[PDB]
């Protein structure tokens, strides 16, 4: 393996002492080689206990090194002091960067010394600069200095990659060495006593700078990383938006030669149309003012790149312009104070001189859309609106509530804020009213939360009480169903692939058509959202209170009206210093259940009005209006060909007419491409944002290092597929430090390639990128059962809370409200849902995961001896694999590439077998009980509970079905027709299609039903054993791509799988689960 070779040179770099030793640990599937592994590991612990070498021992036990596989590498290091600064002065050659002070409009966001920015010790909030990743700066500088000594002696091409990653390191190292490397605590939080003399934003600058200089490959990358590393030391605020500004304009200049398209039922076609790009002179005057704001900010090598591209305006050099936009978001987050983020957001200027003739049409268009979404589930009395108190409470999001409450659960009292834990307390103390929702007014205001965006100003968010979730769950779950059957709302075009969903932009683009994409400056706190948006919905629930006749569908529709009356005036609770500031804010509340289902109504019903007022001058015929919250486009098809004046006079008539409703906007029109989400259609080729901060998190999580090392790799493979190539030798160096564990003092344990890359709970990174590899060899399926044996752990906090008198009083009050019977297969099935729902609490899931890893250390310091006969996914593929016969085969390049930023070893698969044409849905069949229970009751049972029901008596299935609420003639038509007997073979087959994934980070892009992959896969057909047929044609279609990515060549399989081995595998596929299947092997 390649990763093990990077391990044994990382140890020889960080521990350059003669007192240091490395002890490899080995394991094997053989019972004979295991005793070869026990004796070898014992002797290296006795010989290295008292100063004896290992070169005389590795020859004697060379029967175990070349045959068994590496488990871990133990590290002895009697080094008292970290030698980071001792080898930092070797690279600290350049002049130190002096910070600037006149570049920011605030004081704390400037780059001042922390002694001058915070006067005393007690008012030191690190939450403006905190990287909140579980690594350090001292560990990052060892990850670059390891790379800068391995690639010192290089060939004449790879030297220039090393040289450009060195002059960008002397900018970093000569600034850090001037103030010294900061020393963190054990929680990876930079304290005040170390940051007394260091400049503020030195950790989050040098973390965002090291992420950049491990991505500098070409000279086009070096001019960007030289003018962003120097500048991000000075202005932390304006820099991320000045560079990322013209990419909203530059998407409208490129021509269309041959573009993709998606037809009406969402499937992919290819089109060949040639559409000119028509931009007026007021775009090249708005682009020159976007290139003079980048010259006053100091940077001068970026607008020379753009102005050398504006004379071309060609799609061949647009991968350079998408690279400049993506490097802008890597400067780090824009975190600021909670007071200045709200008070700059909650400040808005309303005006009584707004056009009231346009609001009474905008209110009515919200009225006629809310009625249109609920006219069918209210006229027919639906099973989910009649149970709004229960379906909102039984499926309750457990993220957070407003305040911190002292919850007492039996003996163990806990300070929690989770939302379903507040429901358990108030249902125990009786202070929980089902039909009364609390008023958010000048008394009891709304608390606040924040979300940080890598380039945007820090925004606020609203945390409503839990009684504003039970009132709004059942109605808005009926509005998301209509948003998946309408061509306008963007819950419809939401699939796995991105060419299918955002490819209806280029359906109506021609030379007589004009696309129109507008982004409101702030969708919250607009004038058209305070009064005319609530009173359009309250009117829609007056016409819906006349549609039905129940006392219970009206009552849930008089609660969803009461939450809009109470939010017409609102107050936010934000503290500062010692005073609490209550700010009136009657606008929309980003943070309800309603905040996306009613940002697609209020923005469609707004743009259906502003497209009506511009039709007094230009007569057109609109084709689609797709809307996604704020971000919406609307294609307009004209009579004449679109010229340079119809583009200018529509962009002046959509901007001004939006200003007639006091909504400040910029209105951009083009004919070639838009920027709807961060996914950019440019010239018929979808381009992505590609900015994910590796070494900077927006907030500290509920996860450990072994899980934050997986999201460092998962944020890299998304960064690589989207066009931002970070060096794999740096990501692998950063996994060998995060997965480090200190057993005792001066002893670190490092797992090998087989512990991290195997398919289990403890997975960090794949061996070769973009592909999953299920290792079918006997030394690798044997360790998968060793890791699948300890994943089932119990946490003592979740079992002290599950046996309390409060949690049992919540399940028994929820089981009594649901079922009007006695049965305990639901009370034992509801209580297993809220025990699973309490994993969102932080010390519960941390004591789950720490009991996973601390039990892994007992497995890694010794050779593994755990032998078990469990059927895994990796045991199915050991029986299929010897019956494949490979043969080399040639396959031409037919289809066109649609994403130019993809890597070369992925783009060659797309050019040969094609991008995905349609989203494959092969999930078998749902059982006939779950179509009978989910249609009457709102209780969705797990499929391991519906198998437990079927294996009961005939008279105990009928008692269970009548228990939920099913009538007697419907259960007796179920049970009497013996279709409970057929559902044994549809539950057990539902775990086969769940098993293997045709979607991944990379596998979504390809077409798996292509007529060029079906030509290479040559498998003979057997009529029976249907479960085996699926897993043969899926594993064969995955084995060719997993070979054609690694080596760039195509192979053609042949699986003459015999009839005697299919029936042995048919019972292996039905015995993965832990339930009684009728057909077993032995």
């Amino acid at each position: 393996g390649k990763y093990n070779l990077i391990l044994s040179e990382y140890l020889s770099f960080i521990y350059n002492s003669q007192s240091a030793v490395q002890i490899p640990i080995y394991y094997s599937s053989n019972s004979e080689l295991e005793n070869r592994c026990i004796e070898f590991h014992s002797k290296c612990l006795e010989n290295s206990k008292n100063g004896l070498s290992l070169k005389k021992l590795f020859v004697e036990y060379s029967d175990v090194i070349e045959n068994a596989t590496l488990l871990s590498i133990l590290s002895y290091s009697y080094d008292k002091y970290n030698a980071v600064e001792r080898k930092l002065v070797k690279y600290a050659k350049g002049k130190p960067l002096e910070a600037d002070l006149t570049v920011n409009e605030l004081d704390y966001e400037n780059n001042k010394i922390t002694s001058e920015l915070f006067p005393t010790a007690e008012e030191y909030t690190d939450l403006l600069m905190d990287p909140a990743i579980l690594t350090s700066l001292s560990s990052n500088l060892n990850a670059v200095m390891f790379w800068l000594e391995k690639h010192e002696n290089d060939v004449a091409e790879k030297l220039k990659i090393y040289k450009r990653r060195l002059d960008l390191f002397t900018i970093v190292a000569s600034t850090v060495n001037k103030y010294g490397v900061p020393r963190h605590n054990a929680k990876y939080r930079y304290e005040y006593e170390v940051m007394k003399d260091k400049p503020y934003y030195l950790v989050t600058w040098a973390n965002s700078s090291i992420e950049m200089l491990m991505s500098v490959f070409s000279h086009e990358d070096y001019l960007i990383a030289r003018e962003l590393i120097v500048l991000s030391y000075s202005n932390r605020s304006t820099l991320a938006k000045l560079v990322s500004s013209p990419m909203s304009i530059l998407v409208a200049l490129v021509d269309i030669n041959g573009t993709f398209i998606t037809n009406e039922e969402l499937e992919l076609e290819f089109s060949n149309k040639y559409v000119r790009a028509i931009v007026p002179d007021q775009t090249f005057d708005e682009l020159k003012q976007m290139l003079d704001n980048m010259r006053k900010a100091g940077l001068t090598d970026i607008p020379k790149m753009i102005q050398d591209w504006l004379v071309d305006c060609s799609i061949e050099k647009f991968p350079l312009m998408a690279k400049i936009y993506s490097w802008s978001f890597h400067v780090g987050f824009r975190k600021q104070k909670m007071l200045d983020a709200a008070l700059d957001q909650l400040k808005t200027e309303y005006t009584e001189d707004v056009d009231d003739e346009m609001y009474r049409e905008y209110t009515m268009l919200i009225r006629d859309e809310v009625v249109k979404m609920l006219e069918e589930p209210v006229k027919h009395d639906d099973h989910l609106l009649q149970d709004s108190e229960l379906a909102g409470l039984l499926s309750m999001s457990s993220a957070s509530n407003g305040e911190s409450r002292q919850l007492k659960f039996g003996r163990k009292t806990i300070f929690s804020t989770k939302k379903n834990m507040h429901v358990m307390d108030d249902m125990a103390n009786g202070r929980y009213t089902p039909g009364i929702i609390p008023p958010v007014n000048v008394d009891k205001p709304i608390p606040l939360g924040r979300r940080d965006v890598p380039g945007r100003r820090t925004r606020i968010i609203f945390i409503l009480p839990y009684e504003y979730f039970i009132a709004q769950h059942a109605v808005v779950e009926k509005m998301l169903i209509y948003a998946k059957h309408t061509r306008e709302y963007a819950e419809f075009y939401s699939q796995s692939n991105q060419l299918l969903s955002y490819g209806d932009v280029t359906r109506f683009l021609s030379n007589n058509s004009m696309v129109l994409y507008t982004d409101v400056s702030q969708w919250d706190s607009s004038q058209h959202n305070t009064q005319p948006f609530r009173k359009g919905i309250i009117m829609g629930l007056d016409m819906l209170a006349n549609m039905t006749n129940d006392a219970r569908v009206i009552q849930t529709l008089n609660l969803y009206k009461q939450t809009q009356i109470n939010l017409m005036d609102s107050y936010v609770q934000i503290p500062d210093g010692n005073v609490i500031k209550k700010i009136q804010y009657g606008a929309v509340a980003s943070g309800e259940k309603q905040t996306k289902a009613a940002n697609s109504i209020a923005n469609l019903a707004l743009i259906k009005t502003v497209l009506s007022r511009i039709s007094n001058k230009y007569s057109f015929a609109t084709k689609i209006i797709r809307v996604d919250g704020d971000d919406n486009y609307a294609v307009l098809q004209f009579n004449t060909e679109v010229t340079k004046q119809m583009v200018q006079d529509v962009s002046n008539d959509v901007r001004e007419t939006y200003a007639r409703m006091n909504t400040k906007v910029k209105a951009l029109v083009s004919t070639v491409g838009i920027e709807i989400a961060k996914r950019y259609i440019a010239g018929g080729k979808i381009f992505f944002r590609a900015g994910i901060n590796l070494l900077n998190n927006e907030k500290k999580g509920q996860s450990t290092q072994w899980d934050q090392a997986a999201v460092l790799y998962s944020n890299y493979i998304v960064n690589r597929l989207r066009g931002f190539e970070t060096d794999r030798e740096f990501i692998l160096t950063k996994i060998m430090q995060m997965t480090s564990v200190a057993i005792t003092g001066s002893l670190r344990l490092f797992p090998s390639e087989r512990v991290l890359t195997t398919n289990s709970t403890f997975k960090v990174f794949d061996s070769e990128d973009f592909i999953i590899e299920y290792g079918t060899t006997d030394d690798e399926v044997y360790i998968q059962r060793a890791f699948m044996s300890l994943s089932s752990q119990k946490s003592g906090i979740a079992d002290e809370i599950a046996a309390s008198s409060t949690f049992k009083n919540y399940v028994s009050r929820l089981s009594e409200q649901l079922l009007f019977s006695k049965n305990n297969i639901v009370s034992r099935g509801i209580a297993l849902t809220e025990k699973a729902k309490l994993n969102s609490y932080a010390p519960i899931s941390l004591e789950k995961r720490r009991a996973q890893i601390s039990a892994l250390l007992t497995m890694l310091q010794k050779p593994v001896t755990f032998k078990s006969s469990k059927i895994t996914i990796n045991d199915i593929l050991r029986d299929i694999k010897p019956f494949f016969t490979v043969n080399e085969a040639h396959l031409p390049i037919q289809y066109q590439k649609f994403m130019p930023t993809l890597p070369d070893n992925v783009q060659y698969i797309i050019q040969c077998i094609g991008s995905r044409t349609y989203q494959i849905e092969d999930d078998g069949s749902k059982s006939a009980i779950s179509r009978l229970i989910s249609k009457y009751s709102v209780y969705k049972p797990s499929i391991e509970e519906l198998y437990k029901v079927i294996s009961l008596h005939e008279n105990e299935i009928q008692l269970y079905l009548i228990s939920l609420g099913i009538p007697k003639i419907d259960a007796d038509t179920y049970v009497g027709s013996k279709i409970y007997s057929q559902d044994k073979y549809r539950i057990l087959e539902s775990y086969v299609y769940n098993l293997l994934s045709i979607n991944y980070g990379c596998y979504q892009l390809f077409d798996f039903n292509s007529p060029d992959l079906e030509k290479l896969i040559r498998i003979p057909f057997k009529g029976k054993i249907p479960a085996v047929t699926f897993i043969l044609h899926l594993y064969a279609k995955l084995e060719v791509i997993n070979h054609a990515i690694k080596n760039g060549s195509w192979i053609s399989l042949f699986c003459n799988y015999p009839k005697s081995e299919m029936i042995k595998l048919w019972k292996k596929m039905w015995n993965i689960t832990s339930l009684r299947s009728p057909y077993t092997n032995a």
């Binding site: 070779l5 140890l11 020889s12 003669q18 490899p24 070498s53 290992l54 070169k55 590795f58």
Partner: peptide, 13 residues
């Protein structure tokens, strides 16, 4: 000294 690592690195290689 570091003579042990060049004999231990090529064990893995």
């Amino acid at each position: 000294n570091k003579e042990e690592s060049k004999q231990l690195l090529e064990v893995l290689k």
